[PDB]
From Swiss-Prot:
Changing H116 to D/N/Q: Reduced activity. The record marks Y4, N59, N64 as: Fine-tunes the proton-transfer properties of H-64. This is Carbonic anhydrase 2. It catalyses: hydrogencarbonate + H(+) = CO2 + H2O; urea = cyanamide + H2O. Its cofactor is Zn(2+); Co(2+).
Amino acid sequence: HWGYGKHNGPEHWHKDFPIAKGERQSPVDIDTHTAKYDPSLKPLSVSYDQATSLRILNNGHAFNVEFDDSQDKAVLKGGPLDGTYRLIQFHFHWGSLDGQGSEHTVDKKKYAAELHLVHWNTKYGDFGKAVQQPDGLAVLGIFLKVGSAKPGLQKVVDVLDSIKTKGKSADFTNFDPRGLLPESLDYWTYPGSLTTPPLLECITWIVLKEPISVSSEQVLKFRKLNFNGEGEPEELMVDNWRPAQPLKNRQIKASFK
Ligand SMILES: [Zn+2]
């Protein structure tokens, strides 16, 4: 099945998921000089005060911090979005070394990792229906660089030992995702896709310009996770990122001048 290895990685995905070569695939390189300020964008609204985290799961390709999305508790609105999008989970993509890991790139620069807060459009009722629609998901993407520790990330890092292998989960209640946001909400936006199979072209991407800083020790702990299940030969969970895909007939818009 698909993964990030030599024999099942991103360059193979198109065989099972032909949309991999589609017209609005993600991630992309963000060329900062070509992105155009769009005065029509409305202010972005990240409302996470009532967020209810539940569980953290190693799914074999990342770890997901899952939220109660059975009501409007943690929602993304505004910006390029019409309507209300409910937070369902966040996860990261990261590298084997600090010089790679992000999916989006900025003027071809790769960051050490990239955080994805995944939200679905409530007008479609459930996540499974939303992913079948061109405006079904909104993902807030945030770059991670290595430097000072991110205090609001530490509760995540410290539970990783308990979900080392594929299929393991742990209770993860009362986690506040506001502690993972940078100061500025300046962003780039474009229409794209899931970056993992099934690669559905259902996402409005909102990628923040300002990275957050995490420490070397924090990202080292990401890299101790395993793609494999318990008892199986160890395959460190690293380089679980898809590279930049052709922009094709798309324009990246900036929220800032
Ligand atoms: Zn992702």
